[PDB]
Design an enzyme around this catalytic site. Structure first.
Site, PDB file in Angstrom:
ATOM      1  N   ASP A 125      -4.917  -6.370 -12.524  1.00  0.00           N
ATOM      2  CA  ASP A 125      -3.829  -7.031 -11.793  1.00  0.00           C
ATOM      3  C   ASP A 125      -2.799  -7.605 -12.780  1.00  0.00           C
ATOM      4  OD1 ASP A 125      -4.831  -6.442  -9.240  1.00  0.00           O
ATOM      5  OD2 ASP A 125      -5.767  -8.375  -8.906  1.00  0.00           O
ATOM      6  N   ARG A 162       8.074   0.934   7.105  1.00  0.00           N
ATOM      7  CA  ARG A 162       8.485  -0.206   7.930  1.00  0.00           C
ATOM      8  C   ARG A 162       9.989  -0.227   8.207  1.00  0.00           C
ATOM      9  NH1 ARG A 162       4.659  -4.473   4.347  1.00  0.00           N
ATOM     10  NH2 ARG A 162       2.722  -3.502   5.086  1.00  0.00           N
ATOM     11  N   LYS A 198       0.846  -1.192   0.000  1.00  0.00           N
ATOM     12  CA  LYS A 198       0.000   0.000   0.000  1.00  0.00           C
ATOM     13  C   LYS A 198       0.872   1.229   0.000  1.00  0.00           C
ATOM     14  CE  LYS A 198      -2.551  -0.747   3.761  1.00  0.00           C
ATOM     15  NZ  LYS A 198      -2.643   0.737   4.125  1.00  0.00           N
TER      16      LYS A 198
END
Ligand SMILES: CC(C)(COP(=O)(O)OP(=O)(O)OC[C@H]1O[C@@H](n2cnc3c(N)ncnc32)[C@H](O)[C@@H]1OP(=O)(O)O)[C@@H](O)C(=O)NCCC(=O)NCCS
Lengths: 400, 400
Positions: free
Chosen positions: B166, B101, B94
């Site tokens: 996708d 992170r 996302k």
């Protein structure tokens, strides 16, 4: 040839022969990303893409135009000379048409044994006599691959649009040609690539087809844009427009069901605790869920639904109409739609380069060229004199 | 790691982090063509693709499986060690989730300055606070790009199916990563690629959208699978079922008009000699052409129409259902659908390798691996001891 140095593909020499979308899209992507790309057109007959008033300003930007009869006498000699300095040649045609006209892979490799040759056809370079030489477009490839039968409404199949299979097929050719180029660096040997449009689209249509091939059933088509297999997923109507949503996750299902008046289905054999995705085929409450979802969404604006769904962590988006894109904040921030100057000095608007390379970004350095615009420069660059070029033009074998 | 040597990408080391379709499709395509590809999954749960009974056998073939927490403590250390010998890293998340992170592009390049990093997200790596960190889904990308509003019937939009965005987004990441890899080979400098799914789909939807951006009108949706602008193109009914056709070309239009009762339209100001395409709204006889076409096709069988259009060189095909593919002559001749053994010894059927590389063909060498099947061999290959691996496992940072 003179051009700025930019992008991951700077220094690469790419040539394509083809018209309309699939072949040219493959070649022109190399040009978005920095390569020297040459578009070959016939002498008496230009690429039919040129009939469209705006699209080719995008689809033929950053290209050099050569107009040459590549199959006859001096024309063929000039084409095969060009191949001597070309890294990748892309051609789209009806089966093994180049080989029928005397230009076999073996002939190309006599001129450049390192050449990567990408052959894009509807049905492949080999197969049966019935299908191999058939003309193909997007709709044919969709029909023949099982892609078309999976698109549209329950009682009305239709192609995916616009011309979806042409773009998948061109993009695949670019991908495969780059992978082949990688191997040339090690082995010093070229490669031939047989891209059949129906095999491209076969692969893109496997998500449920793999169940059919392995014992199971095929999926039905969507009903009004709702996913055939998963409830709460796909297209829905709000009070003031369309949205998409993806009802996925434990808490998402529980909160949504509370809102729409189906809390009483939660923690039942049909919808057990910890359910994270509702399978509509298996589920006898499938239709009820859609009824209550539709009813709730129908009494709320898009803005209200987006606010509530954000609180609930349910993925959703407004279905944007084309007039809403240019002023959308994400588009604005990322410059997703930009402008550039055409060759004749007019401002043209359309998509920026994609994707965004951090260290070596693409750029728009030239508008669509006119028919044969660079023929003289290209021939001079591969060793032809001014006199030679005029004589090609006078025989009708080239156009400048 | 042990595997056969084959294909244009033999010797390349590719690693991907992501689930479901888009990012894994990008990674797995490298594996089809000979690369060593490592699929990273979490430790205490797996890629949600595994819930599907058959598709993953296709979509995760030829892969090695690593189960590792790449963001925490000794797991992060092992992942960054793996990057030191990785050519291409693909991740879907996302927005700039890796950076949030603790793993920035700069951190990755400290371990490998050559690394090509492909970041696949719904809305890109940067932009607005409102959109950049939103979930990535196929439906959302179609909605947000103007693709969805163009698909479907006149009064009913729908997404292209199955999960078309996708596949386009994954394929683009493969292409872009290979382009950047070429640049690494030329300059020694790695690259970061920002693939926003909505920007991919924006580009695929431009054929008519370019008219809107430059002064004209957006085109309507198809009516029952017929092209919105070109007459004689798209989905038609014969006496015994559906075909597609593309009424394109000078001789094609002449000869078809004669057959269907419109010979008197030829060589007039409305349809000049040499007309190659019928523009249904500009041509005063567009609706008449469809009436006469519909009527003629209705009295003939599919076989009869295919025969006539072969004569006239008019592109057509039967709309094939999935049960018709395996026995189709072109499919049989080209082995377009094949079979292989799963890791637990069962026969699986599905698409062969595409496309067909002549000198260095792809092959199916391995079924889909189980969760963490290769963790111990990968970690050992990059220098971890038997005891180091057991420690990772005890700490819940890896699964073997
Ligand atoms: C697009 C397509 C259907 C057009 O059919 P076509 O029969 O090639 O029609 P064209 O008028 O374009 O070509 C007529 C001849 O001119 C040839 N030609 C092309 N470039 C030429 C050149 N520079 N000089 C001389 N002749 C040329 C074509 O190869 C063809 O030769 P052939 O009749 O011996 O096969 C066909 O090329 C095809 O099926 N291509 C693969 C699928 C595809 O790419 N479709 C387009 C997706 S948008």
């Amino acid at each position: 040839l003179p051009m700025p140095k930019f992008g991951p593909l700077a220094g690469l020499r790419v040539v394509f022969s083809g018209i309309e979308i699939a072949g040219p899209f493959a070649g022109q992507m190399f040009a978005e990303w920095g390569a020297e790309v040459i578009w070959i057109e016939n002498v008496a007959w230009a690429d039919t893409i040129r009939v469209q008033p705006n699209y080719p300003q995008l689809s033929r930007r950053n290209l050099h135009a050569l107009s040459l009869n590549i199959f006859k006498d001096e024309g063929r000699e000039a084409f095969l000379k060009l191949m001597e300095t070309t890294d990748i040649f892309i051609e789209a045609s009806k089966g093994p048409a180049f080989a029928r006209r005397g230009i076999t892979d073996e002939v190309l490799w006599q001129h450049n044994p390192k050449l990567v040759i990408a052959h894009l056809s509807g049905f492949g370079q080999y197969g049966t006599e019935e299908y191999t030489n058939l003309p193909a477009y997007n709709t044919i490839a969709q029909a023949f691959s099982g892609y078309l039968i999976q698109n549209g409404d329950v009682d009305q199949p239709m192609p995916a649009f616009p011309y979806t299979a042409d773009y998948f097929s061109g993009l695949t050719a670019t991908t495969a040609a780059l992978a082949a180029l990688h191997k040339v660096r090690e082995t010093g040997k070229g490669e031939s690539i047989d891209i059949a449009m129906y095999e491209v689209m076969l692969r893109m249509g496997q998500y449920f087809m793999m169940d059919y091939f392995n014992g199971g059933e095929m999926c039905p088509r969507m009903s009004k844009g709702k996913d055939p297999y998963y409830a709460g997923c796909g297209l829905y109507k709000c009070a003031d427009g369309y949205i998409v949503m993806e009802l996925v996750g434990i808490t998402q299902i529980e909160e949504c069901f509370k809102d729409i008046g189906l809390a009483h289905l939660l923690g039942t054999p049909e919808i057990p605790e910890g359910t994270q995705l509702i399978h509509r085929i298996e589920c006898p409450y499938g239709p009820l869920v859609e009824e209550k979802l539709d009813a709730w969404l129908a009494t709320h604006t898009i803005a209200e639904v987006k606010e509530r769904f954000a609180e609930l962590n349910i993925a959703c988006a407004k279905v944007l109409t084309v007039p809403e894109l240019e002023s959308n904040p994400q588009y604005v921030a990322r410059e997703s739609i930009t402008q550039w100057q055409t060759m004749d000095g007019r401002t043209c608007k359309g998509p920026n380069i994609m994707p965004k390379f951090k260290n070596n970004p693409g750029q728009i350095w030239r508008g669509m060229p006119s028919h044969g615009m660079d023929t003289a420069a290209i021939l001079k660059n591969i060793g032809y004199s001014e006199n030679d070029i005029q004589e090609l033009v006078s025989k009708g074998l080239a156009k400048v």
